[PDB]
Design a protein around this ligand. Structure first.
Ligand SMILES: COC1=C(OC)C(=O)C(C/C=C(\C)CC/C=C(\C)CC/C=C(\C)CC/C=C(\C)CC/C=C(\C)CC/C=C(\C)CC/C=C(\C)CCC=C(C)C)=C(C)C1=O
Ligand SMILES: COC1=C(OC)C(=O)C(C/C=C(\C)CC/C=C(\C)CC/C=C(\C)CC/C=C(\C)CC/C=C(\C)CC/C=C(\C)CC/C=C(\C)CCC=C(C)C)=C(C)C1=O
Lengths: 171, 174
């Protein structure tokens, strides 16, 4: 019933390399749906990675995301829709929400800190109140991160990746 | 105007990275802020209100890094073009790039934030960072203090970069 409006939404993440160099990246194409029973799914087109350096995007698409095998990452959660449907337009609810992220067919559970705000009769916003930190090891990507750091000669790429999102859904 | 920040509805957070591979999210519990009708905006952070979930770490940050006894407030200052924001209908959003200045521990540094402004109702707006603002320790002459914290906590490394995010609600009220 609720569908994600990609043009209004943003999913970003921060990498830290060489100890002190933080950079923010994004994915350009998301999809998402929340059904009346509160089953929520967001799908990220991993090919739509955009880090600002095209050759880096390609290396990530080949080596880390492996998009030729896994063009989609999935984020899944189960909401209690009662309090969300009760929000008046303009009103917000803080949700601390278990969810699952699936990357390459590996899944891991995290706890998200989200803010849900009703925008109008048919539009809803969900934002990360604080970014959600994932770790390469959770998806068996440690050797893939280490591979990158090297061939594109760095001291190091941090194995933690904080993820933020502003998601707009429309009825 | 004037617009005032509703602390209970807002959150300013930041991420530190330790031992190369562990990112942790922390926040401040007490903010204030005002935007005047001319678009002059100021956010104050009470730095004593740091919350990392470890009291000892909170105390080290207060004393060593923030020096709350000399500087209990950090300030964020900007000048907004109010017209396009005020023109938003409830539920509508505008992306903007906002030059701003942060003053922390008696030093200042300028940034440009990528923000989304959304009108919530006739007297309330939400402002969120679409990407965090990345502060570096050297921006505020804090490098040695970061290394001191690293040393105190027995860490092999603390990143000198700190991405800062916010979800801020402002209300046209007294
Ligand atoms: C070519 O030149 C090069 C360089 O420079 C020249 C380089 O520096 C480098 C070095 C590499 C760089 C420094 C960058 C490296 C970046 C790294 C390695 C990649 C990290 C990627 C990770 C696997 C993370 C990817 C992100 C995920 C796919 C997204 C997951 C999203 C999750 C966490 C959820 C977030 C959203 C929220 C929780 C909202 C959810 C809410 C819904 C589910 C429900 C909503 C419903 C409502 C109503 C409540 C290279 C390699 C290079 O080639
Ligand atoms: C025993 O316990 C301990 C540990 O546990 C193991 C430790 O790991 C450790 C080791 C320490 C580490 C783990 C942590 C490292 C911490 C380090 C030093 C980080 C330090 C943090 C600071 C330097 C960063 C501070 C950032 C802030 C002050 C800046 C805030 C700026 C904000 C976000 C500005 C953005 C907002 C604006 C752009 C909005 C403008 C307003 C308008 C747009 C509003 C518009 C109005 C309309 C009308 C709506 C210790 C010490 C310990 O004691």
């Amino acid at each position: 019933n609720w569908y994600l409006d990609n043009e209004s939404s943003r999913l970003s993440f921060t990498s830290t390399k060489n100890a002190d160099i933080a950079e923010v990246h994004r994915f350009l194409v998301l999809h998402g749906k929340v059904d009346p029973k509160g089953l929520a799914e967001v799908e990220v087109e991993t090919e739509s990675i955009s880090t600002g350096i095209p050759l880096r995007d390609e290396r990530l698409r080949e080596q880390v995301f492996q998009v030729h095998k896994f063009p989609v990452a999935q984020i899944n959660a189960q909401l209690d829709m009662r309090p969300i449907n009760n929000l008046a337009p303009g009103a917000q609810l803080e949700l601390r929400l278990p969810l699952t992220v699936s990357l390459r067919g590996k899944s891991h559970s995290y706890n998200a800190e989200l803010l849900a705000t009703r925008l109008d009769e048919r539009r809803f916003q969900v934002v990360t109140l604080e970014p959600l930190v994932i770790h390469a090891q959770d998806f068996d990507m440690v050797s893939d991160f280490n591979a990158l750091r090297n061939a594109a000669g760095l001291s190091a790429v941090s194995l933690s990746v904080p993820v933020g999102a502003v998601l707009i859904f429309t009825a």
